[PDB]
């Protein structure tokens, strides 16, 4: 197979321009197709060969001679912030790479720890939930039950339509017999030059 590689899985673009790059593992002879998939929709063909469009908006252009290809969105609007895929059509085994556009925002994370309720503690469980509702970038969550823990499950949404900020919920599942370790703390590490710690005892 041919190792088609889109390096940036996430890109930042607001209204100016976007250059989505695709590096092939082989000289493919200017045979690269560009698809656009929106969430909840199948992929739609944008470009094929070097720069040939297929019934799409004129902002989508493409370039690349061999082993390095680019798709330019010179007019990036709200529908243009979706996932894009570069495909080879040089050899029989077809391969894709994966990429996505995002807007640009500021900074500032949040954190809020929530203990298990009485209803969950009645039916043999204890889930401590750390909500991280608004931030921009990449964030990490550390759970400390007076010791590091690696039994928590994390979930992230996409980027919000209004605030243009991400979110994160981390759930720590602990049984009733293991529910005496001291205090539970949730630590958030973003680009804010310091972790934000919430705790409950």
């Amino acid at each position: 197979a041919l190792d088609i590689n889109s390096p940036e899985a996430e890109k930042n673009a607001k209204g100016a321009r976007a250059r989505i790059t695709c590096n092939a593992g082989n000289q493919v002879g200017s045979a690269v197709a560009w698809f656009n998939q929106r969430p909840g929709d199948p992929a739609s063909l944008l470009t094929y060969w070097a720069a040939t469009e297929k019934g799409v908006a004129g902002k989508q252009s493409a370039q690349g001679a061999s082993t390095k290809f680019s798709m330019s969105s010179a007019g990036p609007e709200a529908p243009s912030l979706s996932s894009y895929w570069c495909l080879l059509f040089e050899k029989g085994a077809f391969s894709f790479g994966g990429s996505k556009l995002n807007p640009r925002e500021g900074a500032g994370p949040q954190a809020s720890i929530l203990p298990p309720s009485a209803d969950l503690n009645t039916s043999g469980g204890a889930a401590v939930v750390c909500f991280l509702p608004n931030w921009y970038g990449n964030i990490t969550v550390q759970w400390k039950t007076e010791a590091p823990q690696s039994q928590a499950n994390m979930s992230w949404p996409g980027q919000a339509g209004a605030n243009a900020a991400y979110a994160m919920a981390a759930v720590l599942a602990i049984t009733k017999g293991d529910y005496g370790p001291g205090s539970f703390t949730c630590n958030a590490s973003n680009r804010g030059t310091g972790p934000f710690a919430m705790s409950l005892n």
């Binding site: 002879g29 040939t52 469009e53 493409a62 050899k91 029989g92």
Partner: protein
Amino acid sequence: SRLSVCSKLCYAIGGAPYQITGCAIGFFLQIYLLDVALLDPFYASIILFVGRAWDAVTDPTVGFLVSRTPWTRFGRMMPWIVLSTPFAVLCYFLIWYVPSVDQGKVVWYLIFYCCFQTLQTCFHVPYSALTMFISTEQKERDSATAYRMTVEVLGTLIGTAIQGQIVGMANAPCISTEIDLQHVSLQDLRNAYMIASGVICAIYVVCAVVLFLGVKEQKDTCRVRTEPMSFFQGICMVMGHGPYAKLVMGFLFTSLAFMLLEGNFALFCIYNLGFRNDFQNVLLVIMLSATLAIPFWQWFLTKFGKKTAVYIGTTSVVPFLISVVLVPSSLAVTYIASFAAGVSVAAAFLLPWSMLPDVVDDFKVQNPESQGHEAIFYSFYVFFTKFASGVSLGVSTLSLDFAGYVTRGCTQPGEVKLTLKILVSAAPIVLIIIGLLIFISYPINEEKRQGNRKLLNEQR
């Protein structure tokens, strides 16, 4: 005060760059649009139809515009040639240039092949009319036409020898597909096509400079005639004659079969025969055999008459066209069939011109009043040989699109190779058989009445 050998040589050399562009386009434009320009074969069918068809249309229109050209300070035909060469070379270079257009390369190519047809038409129709202006002696015009025929055959040989050996020198990688499942670049192939087109454009210019310097028009102003598309009763008079029609329909169908072969033999050599690297050598061997078989058929039309010459000359390619699609792509079989196909090409494009003066004498015997019947016969043949070959090439590339022609490809599916076998083996044999059946219905019966018509030439 006749034409020198240098003036006839310059007039002859001025007709070569053309044949060169005709052989380059007619042998390599389909594979350029399909494999090098990376077009959809529907768009390639559109371009290959519209360039030839529109071309044929412009031929009588530029003939009419040339026939009303007044006498300038340089001549009646030299201003058209001189003012239309530097635009024709630009359009010819931009035919084989692949543009960086995000949508609609078909519009770019459609513009050039067609514009080139107009421009070249504006170069060639005054050039064809120049034979009536170079000299007032009919023997001088016949010697200049013989020189022109020799340099046209040589430029037919050179045009597949420069483009073929330049664009075949630098190859390109091929595109595997699902049927294929279980350092040279594409840009180097495009650069080779640009280099070949630049060499052909340099030849064009050089020969246009030679034609401008070495040929004068003598300011005769002692004759007048009609124009193309001004009248159409002469075409009905020619088509009302029996042998004239029979000859034009036979030569038509035969030229249609061999133009279909010329258009679609490059793809047959690349994919069916597995000769993606050495198809240009096969085309060069075909052109060398067609060049070397012309004195053979010139001796054959005198040794054994002309009825058997056109009966077996145009049908000698039939078992070899069966054999190329009935063997599993052997190299020696390909080369011997290339030699036989070149011999048949030389026969089919030489021997109707040997048949023609007998029909001219028969028409002079039938009609004492004759003016421009040969010119309107050749104009009718040309247009059709152009329009119907454009139809054939468009139908061929559209059938490739329907069959699922992978661009480049390294292996075509069984549907595409069957269409190539039909397009080089079924349809040209059918057109050759139809042309032979038209040649059977021939009331002139070679010289056996035509010499009696020559006695009619002694009568009038």
